[PDB]
Write a protein that binds this ligand. Structure first.
Ligand SMILES: Cc1ccc2c(=O)c3cccc(CC(=O)O)c3oc2c1C
Ligand SMILES: Cc1ccc2c(=O)c3cccc(CC(=O)O)c3oc2c1C
Lengths: 178, 175
């Protein structure tokens, strides 16, 4: 199931959104004294926690600080027709210092995976959901690897949360640094 | 299968966002265009799903399906996806050379995904395989809509196969 879900995420969102990302950064930077930086901050980072319903990003971590919206993106495929999309820019702290600035969001298909799992008749366990989550990521990673213009503009950030000291900020930083 | 997750994502990712505000958007439409819609048959989101990828865009697919107007936009504002603006389009469906029906009409966006999947260099699949998937998608989507009345009565999945669409649409509006 998660195979077609990763494809619809790519086809139905990442394809529409990536190509104009850089231009929107350029603006953002004109208007915020070059807050985005070089290379690290030139990507759309998609968060995919493994372990449903992660904390929303404004509250998840005191070291992940919202700054501002990029300028909106207008789309006009023969969709759909006219659509407006938003993306959000976050300051990422390490040791009390601004260590990174980036565009960051959760993968919407989490919501579908969760909703699937919660359905009364055909819902399924946490373990079965994790198996699907892993399959979504593996499949999305493959798609992106095959598409250099897409891959140069975004990175899937996949992580597991221990219920048992987890900092999402340190995870994002490690990716941003790689 | 893959089309089952796809159906759930069209529902969770689009129909849930769009149907709740539809009637509000229709009423305002009617007021702006002399009650051009309302007849009950004129107040659902009609979603075309040709079982046959890449169906000609609606404005050009059939002389009997003629673009009239856009609904007022639907603004959405959730967590994660902050501001989005969605559009939907209203079509006049002529029969016998004359307007016979008016509706809100669009292609299901997941057609584009079953097609792209099909078309992949590796683990892509044939037309004969992509069709079985399209079938699974339609069935799964019609099962999902059934469990939630608020949604069901506000959209119809028009599924069709080459042996006139405008005649295929009116039948639905009439049902
Ligand atoms: C242009 C395009 C193409 C494919 C999809 C899609 O598979 C898909 C699957 C599930 C949910 C959506 C969201 C939507 O229809 O806006 C999807 O959007 C798509 C869009 C917007
Ligand atoms: C709110 C929400 C929830 C789930 C999905 C989704 O599964 C999903 C899967 C594939 C493609 C999209 C389109 C998008 O993220 O804009 C999807 O959108 C979703 C959206 C917008």
């Amino acid at each position: 199931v998660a195979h077609g879900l990763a494809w619809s995420y790519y086809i139905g969102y990442l394809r529409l959104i990536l190509p104009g990302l850089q231009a929107r950064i350029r603006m953002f930077n004109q208007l915020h004294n070059n807050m985005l930086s070089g290379a690290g901050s030139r990507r759309l980072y998609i968060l995919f926690p493994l372990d449903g319903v992660p904390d929303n990003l404004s509250v998840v971590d005191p070291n992940i600080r919202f700054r501002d919206m990029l300028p909106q993106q207008n789309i006009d495929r023969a969709g759909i027709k006219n659509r407006v999309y938003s993306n959000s820019v976050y300051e990422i702290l390490e040791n009390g210092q601004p260590a990174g600035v980036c565009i960051l969001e959760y993968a919407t298909p989490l919501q579908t995976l969760f909703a699937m799992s919660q359905d009364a008749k055909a819902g399924f366990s946490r373990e079965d959901r994790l198996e699907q989550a892993k399959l979504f990521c593996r499949t999305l990673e493959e798609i992106l690897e095959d598409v250099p213009e897409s891959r140069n503009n975004c990175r899937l950030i996949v992580y597991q949360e221990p219920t048992d000291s987890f900092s999402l900020s340190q995870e994002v930083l490690r990716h941003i640094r790689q």
